[PDB]
Amino acid sequence: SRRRVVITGMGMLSPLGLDVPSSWEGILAGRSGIAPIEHMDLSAYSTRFGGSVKGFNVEEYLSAKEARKLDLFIQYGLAASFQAVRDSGLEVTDANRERIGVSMGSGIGGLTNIENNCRSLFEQGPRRISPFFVPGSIINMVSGFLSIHLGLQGPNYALTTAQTTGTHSIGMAARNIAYGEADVMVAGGSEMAACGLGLGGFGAARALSTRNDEPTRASRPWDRDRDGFVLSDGSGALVLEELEHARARGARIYAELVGFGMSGDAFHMTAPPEDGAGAARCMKNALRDAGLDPRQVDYINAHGTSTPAGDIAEIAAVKSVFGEHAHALSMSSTKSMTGHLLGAAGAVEAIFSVLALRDQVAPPTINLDNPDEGCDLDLVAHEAKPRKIDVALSNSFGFGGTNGTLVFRRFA
Amino acid sequence: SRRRVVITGMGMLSPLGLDVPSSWEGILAGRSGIAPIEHMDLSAYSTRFGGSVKGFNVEEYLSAKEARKLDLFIQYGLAASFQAVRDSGLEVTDANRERIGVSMGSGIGGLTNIENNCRSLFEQGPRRISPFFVPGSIINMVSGFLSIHLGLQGPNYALTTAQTTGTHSIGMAARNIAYGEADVMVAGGSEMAACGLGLGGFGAARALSTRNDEPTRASRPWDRDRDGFVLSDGSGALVLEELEHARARGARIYAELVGFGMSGDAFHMTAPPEDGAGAARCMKNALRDAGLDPRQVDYINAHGTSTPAGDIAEIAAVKSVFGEHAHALSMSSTKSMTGHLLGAAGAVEAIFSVLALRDQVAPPTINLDNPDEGCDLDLVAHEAKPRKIDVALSNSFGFGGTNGTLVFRRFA
Numbered sequence: 001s002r003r004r005v006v007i008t009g010m011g012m013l014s015p016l017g018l019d020v021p022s023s024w025e026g027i028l029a030g031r032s033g034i035a036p037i038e039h040m041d042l043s044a045y046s047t048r049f050g051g052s053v054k055g056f057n058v059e060e061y062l063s064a065k066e067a068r069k070l071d072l073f074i075q076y077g078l079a080a081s082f083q084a085v086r087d088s089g090l091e092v093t094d095a096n097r098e099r100i101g102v103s104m105g106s107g108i109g110g111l112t113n114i115e116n117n118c119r120s121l122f123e124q125g126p127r128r129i130s131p132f133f134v135p136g137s138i139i140n141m142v143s144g145f146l147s148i149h150l151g152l153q154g155p156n157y158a159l160t161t162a163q164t165t166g167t168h169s170i171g172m173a174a175r176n177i178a179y180g181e182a183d184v185m186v187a188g189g190s191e192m193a194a195c196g197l198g199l200g201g202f203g204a205a206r207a208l209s210t211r212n213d214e215p216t217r218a219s220r221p222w223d224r225d226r227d228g229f230v231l232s233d234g235s236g237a238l239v240l241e242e243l244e245h246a247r248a249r250g251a252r253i254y255a256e257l258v259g260f261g262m263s264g265d266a267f268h269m270t271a272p273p274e275d276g277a278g279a280a281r282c283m284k285n286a287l288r289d290a291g292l293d294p295r296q297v298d299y300i301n302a303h304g305t306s307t308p309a310g311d312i313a314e315i316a317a318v319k320s321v322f323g324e325h326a327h328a329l330s331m332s333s334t335k336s337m338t339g340h341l342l343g344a345a346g347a348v349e350a351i352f353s354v355l356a357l358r359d360q361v362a363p364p365t366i367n368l369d370n371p372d373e374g375c376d377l378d379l380v381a382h383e384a385k386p387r388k389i390d391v392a393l394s395n396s397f398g399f400g401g402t403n404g405t406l407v408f409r410r411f412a
Numbered sequence: 413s414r415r416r417v418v419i420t421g422m423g424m425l426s427p428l429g430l431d432v433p434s435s436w437e438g439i440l441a442g443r444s445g446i447a448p449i450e451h452m453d454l455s456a457y458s459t460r461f462g463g464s465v466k467g468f469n470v471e472e473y474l475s476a477k478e479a480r481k482l483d484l485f486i487q488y489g490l491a492a493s494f495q496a497v498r499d500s501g502l503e504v505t506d507a508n509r510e511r512i513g514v515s516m517g518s519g520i521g522g523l524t525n526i527e528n529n530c531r532s533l534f535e536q537g538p539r540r541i542s543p544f545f546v547p548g549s550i551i552n553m554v555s556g557f558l559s560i561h562l563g564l565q566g567p568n569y570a571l572t573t574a575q576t577t578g579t580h581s582i583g584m585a586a587r588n589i590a591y592g593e594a595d596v597m598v599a600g601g602s603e604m605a606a607c608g609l610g611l612g613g614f615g616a617a618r619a620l621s622t623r624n625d626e627p628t629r630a631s632r633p634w635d636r637d638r639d640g641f642v643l644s645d646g647s648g649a650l651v652l653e654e655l656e657h658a659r660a661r662g663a664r665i666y667a668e669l670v671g672f673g674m675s676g677d678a679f680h681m682t683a684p685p686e687d688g689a690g691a692a693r694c695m696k697n698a699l700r701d702a703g704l705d706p707r708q709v710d711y712i713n714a715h716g717t718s719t720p721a722g723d724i725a726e727i728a729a730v731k732s733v734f735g736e737h738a739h740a741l742s743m744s745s746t747k748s749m750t751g752h753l754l755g756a757a758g759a760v761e762a763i764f765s766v767l768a769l770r771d772q773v774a775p776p777t778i779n780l781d782n783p784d785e786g787c788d789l790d791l792v793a794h795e796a797k798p799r800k801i802d803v804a805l806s807n808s809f810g811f812g813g814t815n816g817t818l819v820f821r822r823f824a
């Protein structure tokens with residue numbers, strides 16, 4: 001029967017730092033990780049900025065010989081995974097290696113690599129395609145390479161559910177442990193879609209902020225002057241662990257994962273429904289899964305992408321799920337500071353949600369100068385808000401009408 | 413305790429046919445779907461052949477306008493999914509739509525779309541990238557588009573575990589139903605990687621058969637003259653259904669899904685370990701999950717890719733799991749006929765495992781003219797073998813050492 005699941009380790013690369021504590025300090029100080037992109041010429045592009053990981057050194061983790069074969073999304077995935085496993089204190093042994101798996105996902109995976117090899121194919125010929133093209137680019141190889149490096153023989157898989165990937169990865173990993181398929185899972189996501197096809201593709205859909213002259217003010221969830229999301233890069237990994245297993249080894253427990261919801265919108269390939277009906281179904285699934293009264297929810301880490309339709313749909317969904325309690329909880333979008341890490345969004349945001357529980361503080365929504373029509377909740381505008389938080393919720397929504405909710409609470 | 417899961421609907425595109433009965437007819441006849449690839453310049457490539465879907469008419473499923481927005485891999489997934497649902501006779505209503513979900517996956521995703529958009533990007537710049545590039549290319553859009561078309565509001569996600577995708581998708585969909593998270597799931601996978609990037613990428617790793625002179629003899633699992641896998645395209649979808657729900661509406665039940673196994677090799681990025689230790693753990697996990705003794709297994713649909721290391725690893729693994737029963741079971745590779753559909757391999761091979769149960773026949777391993785050293789099992793060489801089949805296994809072993817096993821049993 002269903003076992004309980006706690007968080008014993010976390011790891012991160014974000015536009016705000018090369019680990020969790022450095023990223024969290026930026027979150028709490030309301031710092032932007034958004035800047036003009038330096039790693040390519042974007043003068044032909046309508047969007048020329050985003051949340052880059054600054055000063056990442058893959059040789060802190062892996063030999064340059066192996067790193068050369070791997071897309072940045074995999075490098076980012078392994079970095080955050082190695083941080084999480086070390087943060088857990090867990091020792092992999094012959095006695096437990098079959099009971100430790102990994103579920104690290106990505107929305108797009110190795111787009112930079114596929115682009116670079118596409119360039120080789122068209123400019124030279126197929127003889128110049130890397131022998132490492134396939135294993136160095138496909139989405140399941142964060143899970144693959146992590147298992148090879150650490151000797152993890154448990155369930156080994158990857159989700160790809162677009163901007164919901166991190167939330168789904170973590171939730172389904174928790175189910176694996178809940179149901180006895182594993183005692184430990186490394187789960188989250190990673191993304192590096194800042195290449196020509198990535199910025200060009202989101203640019204073609206007119207989905208991205210074009211505020212090139214003030215990139216730090218571009219991401220403004222629920223602000224009336226918002227004009228699309230800011231594309232960001234990085235990784236979040238969490239060590240999920242069966243409660244008694246964690247207790248038995250004296251693990252430090254950050255928080256308990258008590259609820260997981262999924263639901264499809266079945267509305268539109270890319271647009272959310274204005275009323276937030278799919279997000280509402282998903283949160284209600286997650287709160288019932290947690291055995292909670294919705295009034296127990298203190299803090300929501302919103303999806304909060306800074307799109308016109310997305311932001312308002314989320315207000316509608318929260319008001320519909322929480323009624324008058326929608327005015328008592330605190331909801332913020334850390335995307336105001338990090339931008340939108342796509343498949344890694346749910347992973348870093350799950351970590352920020354856990355850290356809101358540890359430090360009893362709601363992260364700010366920076367740049368919320370003029371809340372839009374109907375955006376009249378506590379959105380923690382401008383400055384972090386210290387407050388009681390026993391129960392934190394993290395929402396993700398994606399293309400395909402795919403929805404995910406994680407519910408975390410303090411563990412005593 | 414756990415709900416029982418049955419198969420009520422199947423759909424397929426393969427190199428053997430545009431549906432299940434045409435495909436299955438080819439399988440039992442020992443027909444190859446392998447031929448030189450047409451309408452594509454492979455002059456500079458070391459491999460010029462594979463398993464194409466011949467004569468696919470997407471307008472049987474979608475408007476020309478909707479189909480223009482979607483990669484072939486998505487078109488193929490949608491075709492299989494629509495066939496499977498139609499095959500199941502299921503009626504979606506307001507009363508059940510929240511209990512019907514989708515998990516359709518892909519190993520490699522939208523290479524053909526990425527290729528054509530790269531052409532435009534390098535030649536003319538980013539302003540010629542399609543607006544539908546991103547949603548028309550990402551792996552979760554088969555689940556997304558299917559959920560929107562049929563109004564499915566259940567769990568909506570997509571796996572990507574390389575050549576293990578289809579097996580994992582079906583297995584995890586079955587878990588969703590068993591543990592009460594859904595009553596119906598559409599699950600499987602699709603693949604169209606017969607582009608320059610697919611043929612080039614696998615060709616650069618020298619993973620492909622280069623037997624251009626006799627394409628139909630190229631895929632020869634366990635034969636001493638095999639020289640790598642044959643790249644194939646298509647889709648498999650199954651309607652998975654909770655038994656009481658199936659019985660209540662008078663569903664036709666093909667077979668019961670009784671066991672699902674996952675494992676990681678934690679060995680190498682593309683090669684299995686010689687003794688197939690990971691595949692052996694996976695199969696043991698699957699049988700434990702089914703509450704079955706290895707002696708009860710009658711038929712195994714092998715991974716059987718026709719790679720030197722892969723084929724021998726699977727023989728070691730079966731001999732280890734099945735001891736004195738290893739020769740009594742029949743094991744065949746339908747990849748001898750279909751080639752390797754990568755992420756859709758596990759989906760179409762699940763369907764072939766179910767039909768071996770329905771028709772009491774082991775499909776052949778064609779081209780097994782000279783079994784290699786140690787390949788002395790009943791590999792059903794050349795011709796289909798009528799026999800008793802109560803319990804059928806389907807194995808997938810993928811890049812990153814990710815393993816999947818499905819156990820199907822006769823239902824009456």
Ligand SMILES: CC(=O)Nc1cccc(NC(N)=O)c1
Pocket residue numbers: 455456457458
């Ligand atoms: C035709 C022949 O005799 N030899 C040969 C040798 C190397 C490369 C190729 N061409 C290729 N597309 O791989 C052909």
